[PDB]
Design a protein around this ligand. Structure first.
Ligand SMILES: [Mg+2]
Ligand SMILES: [Mg+2]
Ligand SMILES: [Mg+2]
Ligand SMILES: [Mg+2]
Ligand SMILES: [Mg+2]
Ligand SMILES: [Mg+2]
Ligand SMILES: [Mg+2]
Ligand SMILES: [Mg+2]
Ligand SMILES: [Mg+2]
Ligand SMILES: [Mg+2]
Ligand SMILES: [Mg+2]
Ligand SMILES: [Mg+2]
Ligand SMILES: [Mg+2]
Ligand SMILES: [Mg+2]
Ligand SMILES: [Mg+2]
Ligand SMILES: [Mg+2]
Ligand SMILES: [Mg+2]
Ligand SMILES: [Mg+2]
Ligand SMILES: [Mg+2]
Ligand SMILES: [Mg+2]
Ligand SMILES: [Mg+2]
Ligand SMILES: [Mg+2]
Ligand SMILES: [Mg+2]
Ligand SMILES: [Mg+2]
Ligand SMILES: [Mg+2]
Ligand SMILES: [Mg+2]
Ligand SMILES: [Mg+2]
Ligand SMILES: [Mg+2]
Ligand SMILES: [Mg+2]
Ligand SMILES: [Mg+2]
Ligand SMILES: [Mg+2]
Ligand SMILES: [Mg+2]
Ligand SMILES: [Mg+2]
Ligand SMILES: [Mg+2]
Ligand SMILES: [Mg+2]
Ligand SMILES: [Mg+2]
Ligand SMILES: [Mg+2]
Ligand SMILES: [Mg+2]
Ligand SMILES: [Mg+2]
Ligand SMILES: [Mg+2]
Ligand SMILES: [Mg+2]
Ligand SMILES: [Mg+2]
Ligand SMILES: [Mg+2]
Ligand SMILES: [Mg+2]
Ligand SMILES: [Mg+2]
Ligand SMILES: [Mg+2]
Ligand SMILES: [Mg+2]
Ligand SMILES: [Mg+2]
Ligand SMILES: [Mg+2]
Ligand SMILES: [Mg+2]
Ligand SMILES: [Mg+2]
Ligand SMILES: [Mg+2]
Ligand SMILES: [Mg+2]
Ligand SMILES: [Mg+2]
Ligand SMILES: [Mg+2]
Ligand SMILES: [Mg+2]
Ligand SMILES: [Mg+2]
Ligand SMILES: [Mg+2]
Ligand SMILES: [Mg+2]
Ligand SMILES: [Mg+2]
Ligand SMILES: [Mg+2]
Ligand SMILES: [Mg+2]
Ligand SMILES: [Mg+2]
Ligand SMILES: [Mg+2]
Ligand SMILES: [Mg+2]
Ligand SMILES: [Mg+2]
Ligand SMILES: [Mg+2]
Ligand SMILES: [Mg+2]
Ligand SMILES: [Mg+2]
Ligand SMILES: [Mg+2]
Ligand SMILES: [Mg+2]
Ligand SMILES: [Mg+2]
Ligand SMILES: [Mg+2]
Ligand SMILES: [Mg+2]
Ligand SMILES: [Mg+2]
Ligand SMILES: [Mg+2]
Ligand SMILES: [Mg+2]
Ligand SMILES: [Mg+2]
Ligand SMILES: [Mg+2]
Ligand SMILES: [Mg+2]
Ligand SMILES: [Mg+2]
Ligand SMILES: [Mg+2]
Ligand SMILES: [Mg+2]
Ligand SMILES: [Mg+2]
Ligand SMILES: [Mg+2]
Ligand SMILES: [Mg+2]
Ligand SMILES: [Mg+2]
Ligand SMILES: [Mg+2]
Ligand SMILES: [Mg+2]
Ligand SMILES: [Mg+2]
Ligand SMILES: [Mg+2]
Ligand SMILES: [Mg+2]
Ligand SMILES: [Mg+2]
Ligand SMILES: [Mg+2]
Ligand SMILES: [Mg+2]
Ligand SMILES: [Mg+2]
Ligand SMILES: [Mg+2]
Ligand SMILES: [Mg+2]
Ligand SMILES: [Mg+2]
Ligand SMILES: [Mg+2]
Ligand SMILES: [Mg+2]
Ligand SMILES: [Mg+2]
Ligand SMILES: [Mg+2]
Ligand SMILES: [Mg+2]
Ligand SMILES: [Mg+2]
Ligand SMILES: [Mg+2]
Ligand SMILES: [Mg+2]
Ligand SMILES: [Mg+2]
Ligand SMILES: [Mg+2]
Ligand SMILES: [Mg+2]
Ligand SMILES: [Mg+2]
Ligand SMILES: [Mg+2]
Ligand SMILES: [Mg+2]
Ligand SMILES: [Mg+2]
Ligand SMILES: [Mg+2]
Ligand SMILES: [Mg+2]
Ligand SMILES: [Mg+2]
Ligand SMILES: [Mg+2]
Ligand SMILES: [Mg+2]
Ligand SMILES: [Mg+2]
Ligand SMILES: [Mg+2]
Ligand SMILES: [Mg+2]
Ligand SMILES: [Mg+2]
Ligand SMILES: [Mg+2]
Ligand SMILES: [Mg+2]
Ligand SMILES: [Mg+2]
Ligand SMILES: [Mg+2]
Ligand SMILES: [Mg+2]
Ligand SMILES: [Mg+2]
Ligand SMILES: [Mg+2]
Ligand SMILES: [Mg+2]
Ligand SMILES: [Mg+2]
Ligand SMILES: [Mg+2]
Ligand SMILES: [Mg+2]
Ligand SMILES: [Mg+2]
Ligand SMILES: [Mg+2]
Ligand SMILES: [Mg+2]
Ligand SMILES: [Mg+2]
Ligand SMILES: [Mg+2]
Ligand SMILES: [Mg+2]
Ligand SMILES: [Mg+2]
Ligand SMILES: [Mg+2]
Ligand SMILES: [Mg+2]
Ligand SMILES: [Mg+2]
Ligand SMILES: [Mg+2]
Ligand SMILES: [Mg+2]
Ligand SMILES: [Mg+2]
Ligand SMILES: [Mg+2]
Ligand SMILES: [Mg+2]
Ligand SMILES: [Mg+2]
Ligand SMILES: [Mg+2]
Ligand SMILES: [Mg+2]
Ligand SMILES: [Mg+2]
Ligand SMILES: [Mg+2]
Ligand SMILES: [Mg+2]
Ligand SMILES: [Mg+2]
Ligand SMILES: [Mg+2]
Ligand SMILES: [Mg+2]
Ligand SMILES: [Mg+2]
Ligand SMILES: [Mg+2]
Ligand SMILES: [Mg+2]
Ligand SMILES: [Mg+2]
Ligand SMILES: [Mg+2]
Ligand SMILES: [Mg+2]
Ligand SMILES: [Mg+2]
Ligand SMILES: [Mg+2]
Ligand SMILES: [Mg+2]
Ligand SMILES: [Mg+2]
Ligand SMILES: [Mg+2]
Ligand SMILES: [Mg+2]
Ligand SMILES: [Mg+2]
Ligand SMILES: [Mg+2]
Ligand SMILES: [Mg+2]
Ligand SMILES: [Mg+2]
Ligand SMILES: [Mg+2]
Ligand SMILES: [Mg+2]
Ligand SMILES: [Mg+2]
Ligand SMILES: [Mg+2]
Ligand SMILES: [Mg+2]
Ligand SMILES: [Mg+2]
Ligand SMILES: [Mg+2]
Ligand SMILES: [Mg+2]
Ligand SMILES: [Mg+2]
Ligand SMILES: [Mg+2]
Ligand SMILES: [Mg+2]
Ligand SMILES: [Mg+2]
Ligand SMILES: [Mg+2]
Ligand SMILES: [Mg+2]
Ligand SMILES: [Mg+2]
Ligand SMILES: [Mg+2]
Ligand SMILES: [Mg+2]
Ligand SMILES: [Mg+2]
Ligand SMILES: [Mg+2]
Ligand SMILES: [Mg+2]
Ligand SMILES: [Mg+2]
Ligand SMILES: [Mg+2]
Ligand SMILES: [Mg+2]
Ligand SMILES: [Mg+2]
Ligand SMILES: [Mg+2]
Ligand SMILES: [Mg+2]
Ligand SMILES: [Mg+2]
Ligand SMILES: [Mg+2]
Ligand SMILES: [Mg+2]
Ligand SMILES: [Mg+2]
Ligand SMILES: [Mg+2]
Ligand SMILES: [Mg+2]
Ligand SMILES: [Mg+2]
Ligand SMILES: [Mg+2]
Ligand SMILES: [Mg+2]
Ligand SMILES: [Mg+2]
Ligand SMILES: [Mg+2]
Ligand SMILES: [Mg+2]
Ligand SMILES: [Mg+2]
Ligand SMILES: [Mg+2]
Ligand SMILES: [Mg+2]
Ligand SMILES: [Mg+2]
Ligand SMILES: [Mg+2]
Ligand SMILES: [Mg+2]
Ligand SMILES: [Mg+2]
Ligand SMILES: [Mg+2]
Ligand SMILES: [Mg+2]
Ligand SMILES: [Mg+2]
Ligand SMILES: [Mg+2]
Ligand SMILES: [Mg+2]
Ligand SMILES: [Mg+2]
Ligand SMILES: [Mg+2]
Ligand SMILES: [Mg+2]
Ligand SMILES: [Mg+2]
Ligand SMILES: [Mg+2]
Ligand SMILES: [Mg+2]
Ligand SMILES: [Mg+2]
Ligand SMILES: [Mg+2]
Ligand SMILES: [Mg+2]
Ligand SMILES: [Mg+2]
Ligand SMILES: [Mg+2]
Ligand SMILES: [Mg+2]
Ligand SMILES: [Mg+2]
Ligand SMILES: [Mg+2]
Ligand SMILES: [Mg+2]
Ligand SMILES: [Mg+2]
Ligand SMILES: [Mg+2]
Ligand SMILES: [Mg+2]
Ligand SMILES: [Mg+2]
Ligand SMILES: [Mg+2]
Ligand SMILES: [Mg+2]
Ligand SMILES: [Mg+2]
Ligand SMILES: [Mg+2]
Ligand SMILES: [Mg+2]
Ligand SMILES: [Mg+2]
Ligand SMILES: [Mg+2]
Ligand SMILES: [Mg+2]
Ligand SMILES: [Mg+2]
Ligand SMILES: [Mg+2]
Ligand SMILES: [Mg+2]
Ligand SMILES: [Mg+2]
Ligand SMILES: [Mg+2]
Ligand SMILES: [Mg+2]
Ligand SMILES: [Mg+2]
Ligand SMILES: [Mg+2]
Ligand SMILES: [Mg+2]
Ligand SMILES: [Mg+2]
Ligand SMILES: [Mg+2]
Ligand SMILES: [Mg+2]
Ligand SMILES: [Mg+2]
Ligand SMILES: [Mg+2]
Ligand SMILES: [Mg+2]
Ligand SMILES: [Mg+2]
Ligand SMILES: [Mg+2]
Ligand SMILES: [Mg+2]
Ligand SMILES: [Mg+2]
Ligand SMILES: [Mg+2]
Ligand SMILES: [Mg+2]
Ligand SMILES: [Mg+2]
Ligand SMILES: [Mg+2]
Ligand SMILES: [Mg+2]
Ligand SMILES: [Mg+2]
Ligand SMILES: [Mg+2]
Ligand SMILES: [Mg+2]
Ligand SMILES: [Mg+2]
Ligand SMILES: [Mg+2]
Ligand SMILES: [Mg+2]
Ligand SMILES: [Mg+2]
Ligand SMILES: [Mg+2]
Ligand SMILES: [Mg+2]
Ligand SMILES: [Mg+2]
Ligand SMILES: [Mg+2]
Ligand SMILES: [Mg+2]
Ligand SMILES: [Mg+2]
Ligand SMILES: [Zn+2]
Lengths: 131, 4, 204, 118, 122, 59
RNA sequence: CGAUGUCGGCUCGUCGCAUCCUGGGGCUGAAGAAGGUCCCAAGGGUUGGGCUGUUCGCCCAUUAAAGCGGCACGCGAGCUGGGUUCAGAACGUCGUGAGACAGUUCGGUCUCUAUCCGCCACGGGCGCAGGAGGCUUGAGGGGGGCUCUUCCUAGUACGAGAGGACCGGAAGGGACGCACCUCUGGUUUCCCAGCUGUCCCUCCAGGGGCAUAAGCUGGGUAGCCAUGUGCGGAAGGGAUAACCGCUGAAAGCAUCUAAGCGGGAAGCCCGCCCCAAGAUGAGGCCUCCCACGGCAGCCGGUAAGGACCCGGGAAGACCACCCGGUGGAUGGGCCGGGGGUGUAAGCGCCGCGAGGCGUUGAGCCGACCGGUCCCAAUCGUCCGAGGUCU
RNA sequence: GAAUGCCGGCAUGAGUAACGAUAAAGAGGGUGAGAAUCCCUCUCGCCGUAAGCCCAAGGGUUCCUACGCAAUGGUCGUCAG
RNA sequence: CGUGAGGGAAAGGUGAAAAGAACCCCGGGAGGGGAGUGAAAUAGAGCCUGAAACCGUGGGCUUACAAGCAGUCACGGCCCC
């Protein structure tokens, strides 16, 4: 037996390929399916990706956003079926895989340390020019 | 012991 | 009452109705029947099951004779499931349907010689305020001249884990007949690659 | 507990165990065969195989990589121009460990030879 | 994960600024309060002429926690502070405004009034 | 601690009984297929230097 | 008195029941709800904090409840040392004085090694009439045993109103317990990077040592883990306690009883989980070997088998246990993947320069999932039945 | 036969605690009846207001060389105060 | 041993005579085995006699379901004379 393959076989039903690639430091918007008492609506969450912990189907990622004065961190399974879609808002450039340190930075300090990732901004704009 |  | 011999594979979580469901994946069957314990012969009702094929050049003559009376290949493991007389001569995952509750028996992980804090959740001693080399010690173990001794079954240090453990009433999340797979919500005793026994539940 | 923890400690702290493997590496690549105790020999197979493998690759990067362990350019030159070519078609297994029949007199230690393979 | 001695910010206009939890009103001996649980607490700092003063023993419901709370969809949410809203014995808010986001768990636990006064439910 | 101490001297019976697990086992030895000398298994012969058919060490 | 360490606390339990809560009852000055009093009941439970050395007690916030006692006022060869209980000092008091005070005040040396019993774990030996490899029965033990909130029934019964059920039925919590690592969250002593001072390689570039037994800092697989996850307390059957009966005399009536028969507890038995035939009363089933050679015995060669040795293991202090040993994937190497880190070196271009950009998600890379005989488990040895008597 | 008697001998605890700073080791080559421990080389680590050098007390041949290994050295010893 | 005044041990025996064991053997030595001396060599210098505790080797009887101040009384089994 190959035990690793069997887990990968159980997981294949639930893997997604519709979601666009992103990186810690990018600003991202997650359109997320929510249940509010009776109905179920779609609530968008937009902030900076601070962490991506990889494990194949079990990979997750963490988004941080300020909301009416308070910091809110929100953790998302990458292959969650509740995620309607993910839309890139901005490419940022980090120098390390985890961005915990920005929790202690001012707004200006963050801006100066996570600058636009012009190289990948170009790759996005280069594509999407599909015809 | 200090049995005092 | 029905059961099967399995292999613990690993853990994952699937999604069912917008909820995350942790699971343990178990490679249960297929288990051929090798011998039947009858009240006329042995005194009780059970099935002896085989599991995992074995190198026939690795199974001595006493065991080969046993496999020959049932006309089966050599199997690595032989275990009995009591009070189960299946119709066929082979037992596969399809005796379980999704939604049934099962009990699973495996051999827990072995901590070797375990201190009383890890073995029995004792409180140890303080870590400052004068505490003198008793930081993880059991404390007192008795009284004085009456009874002048220590109770049997006293909780003390010693080996821990690598013991038979059954967890009971686990929900079967899915069955995949094509791969001899059995999904089960929650945690199962032992390490990945450990043998496990899956039985229909006894909680009503 | 120790479940699934790879590698030996050899009653040496972290800097001392590393220097131990490097010195054994220098002496094995220098003499072709050495004698140590059995546990040290077993652990030397991997530390040396890796350097020999990178020496098969042959780039400047590989050479700078090996020099972090071996430190002696002549020894590295010898590993690149004489040792390495002997193993162009060999996929692992560049070293072998055989056990000797008698123990060291002062402490009982079982001994073993460790050598580069033909 | 709020326990006795834990300080909490005050996410309302009651007048209290900081409260110190003294009890987890959940059973005989709950170790920890989370989002949607009620505590008893002492008002450690107030603004002058508010509805509550320093040294008042009040009730409040926890609306934000720094320990991240998990969810059945497999996700989680985590705030920067520990915040609560002061209630009376009918779980209704004793102030008229609610500052900052609150968790969606409060809805299930029957604190609908705070939820609607909240500027964002996450 | 309070210096635990032997309460009674051990008798010759008990002292010797404790040692019932002290005998040495004789060394495991097999003949060398090349020179027929008695040697431990899985070691190079220390008399003719052979292992696994071929010569390995000088002796 | 050739010494039985002395208060309180901490840790660790265990027992009694005159029961604090939870279960079952009778009486009530019991309408309902909620109480009072007494009976049965020891299975489980019986919280966190302020003050004091305190025990105790009061107080805060809870709670189903915040029970009372025993075990050398349980437990100092288990810990503490606040008090008490030497030597210093001082206050009030007493004494001419030296000094004195269950009066107060500040300070004050608590001893590495367990021989026997006992306890927790783990082996060695022999036994279980032939010898073996498997799979099991369960005598007998151990674990477990808690409990609250809301909703529906129904704003119904009951009650002027306030208030507000039994029985039955759902949902969700607290604390405890066993297992687990998919998620959340730790660790991750060298898996990756960044930084300083210094010495060194080899001058630049690039690196190595030391700054801890990681120099420092930012991260971090597997494993081990709780703060995280799954599951458990039952259900059910049986016999009972207090208590309530049916039928029914002695005693024409009455009587739960003298003959007989019911109902009835979180408690008792079984049922659930675990250990278990040294259960010497040493059990049972399947399968394998077999009448070998020399004066219930004897000593040698074999049998089925086992051990020795070796490669290892989420097994482990040693021992044991489990897997493998060339008809082999057991460890090491190598390769593919996962994973961590976060774009190596070198070269090219831009800048006076610190640097920046591209090559490039590169380079490095523990343990995880697999592949591959490249390296090492070579070659072997030694035990091992001929089955006692009616 | 006893005086926790006196002197001496030998037991038990036990192959048990310990073998005296956690600055640290590895290999090769020699010597020799015998080598983790002596000699030589290379690598590694530790002190460097010393763990380096020179005086004075105190000690009194311990200095140098050859030949030695019973005892002394907390192991070993071919080395050595 | 004590700065010092001062304190203050242990330790006798080959044989009549050294005839004190040439020489060979294993062993680095120590030690031993022969040969030889002697009336005698468990008189061989670690030496007259050589008690006891204590240690070991060999043999007889006995012991792994059993409760003990260890003995004693009885009977039986085995071994010896
Ligand atoms: Mg499969
Ligand atoms: Mg996996
Ligand atoms: Mg922002
Ligand atoms: Mg920048
Ligand atoms: Mg910057
Ligand atoms: Mg860019
Ligand atoms: Mg895993
Ligand atoms: Mg499904
Ligand atoms: Mg099993
Ligand atoms: Mg196990
Ligand atoms: Mg575990
Ligand atoms: Mg272990
Ligand atoms: Mg402990
Ligand atoms: Mg435990
Ligand atoms: Mg445990
Ligand atoms: Mg613990
Ligand atoms: Mg504690
Ligand atoms: Mg404590
Ligand atoms: Mg603690
Ligand atoms: Mg400590
Ligand atoms: Mg102390
Ligand atoms: Mg102390
Ligand atoms: Mg201590
Ligand atoms: Mg300490
Ligand atoms: Mg006592
Ligand atoms: Mg006591
Ligand atoms: Mg007693
Ligand atoms: Mg075990
Ligand atoms: Mg268990
Ligand atoms: Mg359930
Ligand atoms: Mg298992
Ligand atoms: Mg197995
Ligand atoms: Mg451990
Ligand atoms: Mg450890
Ligand atoms: Mg491994
Ligand atoms: Mg050590
Ligand atoms: Mg050490
Ligand atoms: Mg060492
Ligand atoms: Mg050691
Ligand atoms: Mg270091
Ligand atoms: Mg060597
Ligand atoms: Mg060595
Ligand atoms: Mg490697
Ligand atoms: Mg080059
Ligand atoms: Mg070998
Ligand atoms: Mg050996
Ligand atoms: Mg030696
Ligand atoms: Mg030695
Ligand atoms: Mg505010
Ligand atoms: Mg606010
Ligand atoms: Mg005010
Ligand atoms: Mg104030
Ligand atoms: Mg005030
Ligand atoms: Mg309020
Ligand atoms: Mg709203
Ligand atoms: Mg003590
Ligand atoms: Mg102590
Ligand atoms: Mg002590
Ligand atoms: Mg002692
Ligand atoms: Mg005595
Ligand atoms: Mg003794
Ligand atoms: Mg005696
Ligand atoms: Mg005796
Ligand atoms: Mg004896
Ligand atoms: Mg003994
Ligand atoms: Mg012993
Ligand atoms: Mg022996
Ligand atoms: Mg006395
Ligand atoms: Mg005495
Ligand atoms: Mg006495
Ligand atoms: Mg005393
Ligand atoms: Mg005494
Ligand atoms: Mg005493
Ligand atoms: Mg305490
Ligand atoms: Mg008690
Ligand atoms: Mg009573
Ligand atoms: Mg009641
Ligand atoms: Mg009651
Ligand atoms: Mg009333
Ligand atoms: Mg009532
Ligand atoms: Mg009543
Ligand atoms: Mg009554
Ligand atoms: Mg009770
Ligand atoms: Mg009680
Ligand atoms: Mg205070
Ligand atoms: Mg207190
Ligand atoms: Mg008190
Ligand atoms: Mg008291
Ligand atoms: Mg008092
Ligand atoms: Mg009540
Ligand atoms: Mg009350
Ligand atoms: Mg209290
Ligand atoms: Mg008491
Ligand atoms: Mg009590
Ligand atoms: Mg008493
Ligand atoms: Mg008393
Ligand atoms: Mg008293
Ligand atoms: Mg006491
Ligand atoms: Mg005490
Ligand atoms: Mg003490
Ligand atoms: Mg005490
Ligand atoms: Mg005591
Ligand atoms: Mg004591
Ligand atoms: Mg004690
Ligand atoms: Mg005592
Ligand atoms: Mg203790
Ligand atoms: Mg004191
Ligand atoms: Mg006082
Ligand atoms: Mg006065
Ligand atoms: Mg007077
Ligand atoms: Mg007077
Ligand atoms: Mg006076
Ligand atoms: Mg006084
Ligand atoms: Mg007093
Ligand atoms: Mg007094
Ligand atoms: Mg007084
Ligand atoms: Mg006082
Ligand atoms: Mg005073
Ligand atoms: Mg005092
Ligand atoms: Mg002081
Ligand atoms: Mg003190
Ligand atoms: Mg000590
Ligand atoms: Mg003992
Ligand atoms: Mg002890
Ligand atoms: Mg005793
Ligand atoms: Mg014992
Ligand atoms: Mg045994
Ligand atoms: Mg039998
Ligand atoms: Mg048999
Ligand atoms: Mg068997
Ligand atoms: Mg039977
Ligand atoms: Mg059984
Ligand atoms: Mg039973
Ligand atoms: Mg018994
Ligand atoms: Mg119960
Ligand atoms: Mg209603
Ligand atoms: Mg009705
Ligand atoms: Mg009402
Ligand atoms: Mg109900
Ligand atoms: Mg309990
Ligand atoms: Mg546990
Ligand atoms: Mg686990
Ligand atoms: Mg994992
Ligand atoms: Mg984790
Ligand atoms: Mg994590
Ligand atoms: Mg390492
Ligand atoms: Mg490295
Ligand atoms: Mg440097
Ligand atoms: Mg140089
Ligand atoms: Mg440079
Ligand atoms: Mg560079
Ligand atoms: Mg250096
Ligand atoms: Mg240094
Ligand atoms: Mg430091
Ligand atoms: Mg470093
Ligand atoms: Mg971390
Ligand atoms: Mg780190
Ligand atoms: Mg990890
Ligand atoms: Mg991890
Ligand atoms: Mg992990
Ligand atoms: Mg774990
Ligand atoms: Mg927890
Ligand atoms: Mg009646
Ligand atoms: Mg009647
Ligand atoms: Mg009548
Ligand atoms: Mg009757
Ligand atoms: Mg009845
Ligand atoms: Mg009944
Ligand atoms: Mg119940
Ligand atoms: Mg069993
Ligand atoms: Mg048996
Ligand atoms: Mg059994
Ligand atoms: Mg018998
Ligand atoms: Mg019998
Ligand atoms: Mg029998
Ligand atoms: Mg019996
Ligand atoms: Mg049997
Ligand atoms: Mg072992
Ligand atoms: Mg091992
Ligand atoms: Mg051993
Ligand atoms: Mg071992
Ligand atoms: Mg062995
Ligand atoms: Mg076995
Ligand atoms: Mg087996
Ligand atoms: Mg085998
Ligand atoms: Mg073989
Ligand atoms: Mg084999
Ligand atoms: Mg392999
Ligand atoms: Mg395989
Ligand atoms: Mg491999
Ligand atoms: Mg290994
Ligand atoms: Mg890779
Ligand atoms: Mg990858
Ligand atoms: Mg990756
Ligand atoms: Mg990668
Ligand atoms: Mg670049
Ligand atoms: Mg580059
Ligand atoms: Mg560069
Ligand atoms: Mg230029
Ligand atoms: Mg840059
Ligand atoms: Mg490297
Ligand atoms: Mg590599
Ligand atoms: Mg192949
Ligand atoms: Mg052979
Ligand atoms: Mg007398
Ligand atoms: Mg004496
Ligand atoms: Mg005397
Ligand atoms: Mg005497
Ligand atoms: Mg004397
Ligand atoms: Mg004396
Ligand atoms: Mg003496
Ligand atoms: Mg004498
Ligand atoms: Mg004496
Ligand atoms: Mg002596
Ligand atoms: Mg003796
Ligand atoms: Mg002795
Ligand atoms: Mg002695
Ligand atoms: Mg001894
Ligand atoms: Mg030993
Ligand atoms: Mg030893
Ligand atoms: Mg001992
Ligand atoms: Mg020991
Ligand atoms: Mg000692
Ligand atoms: Mg030791
Ligand atoms: Mg010492
Ligand atoms: Mg030393
Ligand atoms: Mg030091
Ligand atoms: Mg040392
Ligand atoms: Mg230093
Ligand atoms: Mg250092
Ligand atoms: Mg070396
Ligand atoms: Mg060396
Ligand atoms: Mg050396
Ligand atoms: Mg050497
Ligand atoms: Mg040579
Ligand atoms: Mg040496
Ligand atoms: Mg030597
Ligand atoms: Mg040395
Ligand atoms: Mg030297
Ligand atoms: Mg070298
Ligand atoms: Mg300097
Ligand atoms: Mg300087
Ligand atoms: Mg030093
Ligand atoms: Mg002198
Ligand atoms: Mg001299
Ligand atoms: Mg000497
Ligand atoms: Mg010597
Ligand atoms: Mg010598
Ligand atoms: Mg001499
Ligand atoms: Mg000496
Ligand atoms: Mg010596
Ligand atoms: Mg010494
Ligand atoms: Mg010599
Ligand atoms: Mg000298
Ligand atoms: Mg003197
Ligand atoms: Mg004196
Ligand atoms: Mg003198
Ligand atoms: Mg004197
Ligand atoms: Mg004499
Ligand atoms: Mg004479
Ligand atoms: Mg004469
Ligand atoms: Mg001569
Ligand atoms: Mg000669
Ligand atoms: Mg010779
Ligand atoms: Mg000779
Ligand atoms: Mg010599
Ligand atoms: Mg001689
Ligand atoms: Mg001899
Ligand atoms: Mg002689
Ligand atoms: Mg003669
Ligand atoms: Mg003689
Ligand atoms: Mg004589
Ligand atoms: Mg004589
Ligand atoms: Mg004479
Ligand atoms: Mg004599
Ligand atoms: Mg004598
Ligand atoms: Mg004698
Ligand atoms: Mg004698
Ligand atoms: Mg002897
Ligand atoms: Mg004997
Ligand atoms: Mg004998
Ligand atoms: Mg007997
Ligand atoms: Mg019996
Ligand atoms: Mg017997
Ligand atoms: Mg007996
Ligand atoms: Mg007697
Ligand atoms: Mg008798
Ligand atoms: Mg008689
Ligand atoms: Zn040979």
């Amino acid at each position: 037996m190959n035990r690793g393959a069997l887990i990968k076989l159980v997981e294949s039903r639930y893997v997604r390929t519709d979601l666009p690639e992103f990186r810690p430091g990018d600003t991202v918007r997650v359109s997320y399916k929510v249940k509010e008492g009776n109905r179920t609506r779609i609530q968008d969450f937009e902030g900076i990706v601070i962490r991506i912990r990889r494990n194949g189907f079990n990979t997750t990622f963490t988004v941080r956003k300020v909301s009416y004065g308070v910091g809110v961190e929100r953790i998302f399974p990458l292959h969650s079926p509740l995620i309607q879609k993910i839309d890139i808002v901005q490419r940022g450039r980090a120098r390390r895989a985890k961005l915990y340190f920005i929790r202690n930075l001012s707004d200006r300090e963050i801006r100066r340390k996570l600058r636009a990732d012009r190289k990948r901004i170009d790759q996005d704009r280069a594509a999407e020019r599909a015809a | 012991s200090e049995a005092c | 009452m029905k059961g099967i011999l399995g292999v613990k594979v690993g853990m994952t979580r699937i999604f069912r109705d917008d909820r995350a469901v942790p699971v343990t994946v178990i490679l249960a069957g297929p288990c051929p029947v090798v011998q039947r314990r009858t009240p006329e012969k042995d005194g009780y009702t059970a099935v002896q099951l085989g599991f995992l094929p074995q190198n026939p050049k690795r199974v001595n003559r006493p065991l080969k004779g046993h496999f020959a009376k049932a006309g089966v290949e050599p199997v690595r493991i032989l275990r009995e499931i009591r009070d189960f007389n299946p119709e066929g001569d082979t037992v596969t995952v399809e005796i379980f349907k999704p939604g049934e509750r099962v009990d699973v028996t495996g051999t827990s992980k072995g901590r070797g010689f375990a201190g009383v804090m890890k073995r029995w959740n004792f409180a140890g001693g303080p870590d400052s305020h004068g505490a003198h080399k008793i930081h993880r010690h059991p404390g007192s173990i008795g009284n004085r001249k009456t009874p002048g001794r220590v109770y049997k079954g006293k909780k003390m240090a010693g080996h821990y884990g690598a013991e038979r453990v059954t967890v009971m009433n686990l929900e079967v999340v899915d069955v995949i007949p094509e791969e001899n797979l059995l999904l089960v919500k929650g945690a199962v005793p032992g390490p990945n690659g450990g043998l496990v026994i899956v039985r229909e539940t006894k909680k009503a | 507990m120790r479940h699934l923890k790879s590698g030996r400690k050899l009653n040496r702290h972290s800097s001392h165990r590393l220097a131990l493997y490097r010195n054994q590496a220098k002496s094995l690549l220098t003499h072709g065969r050495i004698t140590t105790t059995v546990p040290k020999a077993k652990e030397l197979r991997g530390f040396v195989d890796h350097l020999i493998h990178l020496a098969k690759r042959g780039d400047l990067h590989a050479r700078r990589l090996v020099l972090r362990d071996l430190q002696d350019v002549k020894l590295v030159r010898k590993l690149f121009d004489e040792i390495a070519p002997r193993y162009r078609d060999r996929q692992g297994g560049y070293t072998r460990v055989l056990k000797l029949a008698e123990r060291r007199r002062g402490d009982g230690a079982p001994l073993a030879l460790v050598e580069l393979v033909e | 994960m709020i326990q006795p001695q834990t300080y909490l910010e005050v996410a309302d206009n009651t007048g209290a600024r900081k409260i110190m939890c003294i009890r987890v009103l959940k059973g005989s001996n709950a170790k920890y309060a989370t989002v949607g649980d009620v505590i008893v607490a002492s008002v450690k700092e107030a603004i002058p002429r508010g509805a509550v003063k320093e040294g008042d023993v009040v009730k409040a419901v926890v609306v934000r926690t720094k320990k991240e709370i998990k969810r059945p969809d497999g996700s989680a949410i985590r705030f920067d502070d520990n915040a609560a809203v002061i209630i009376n014995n009918q779980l209704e808010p004793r102030g008229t405004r609610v500052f900052g986001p609150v968790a969606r768990e409060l809805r299930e636990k029957g604190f609908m009034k705070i939820v609607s006064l909240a500027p964002e439910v996450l | 601690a309070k210096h635990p101490v032997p309460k009674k001297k051990t008798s010759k019976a008990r002292r010797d009984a404790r040692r019932s697990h002290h005998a040495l086992t004789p060394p495991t030895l097999v003949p060398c297929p090349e020179c027929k000398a008695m040697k431990p298994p899985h070691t190079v012969c220390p008399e003719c230097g052979y292992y696994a058919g071929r010569k390995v060490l000088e002796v």
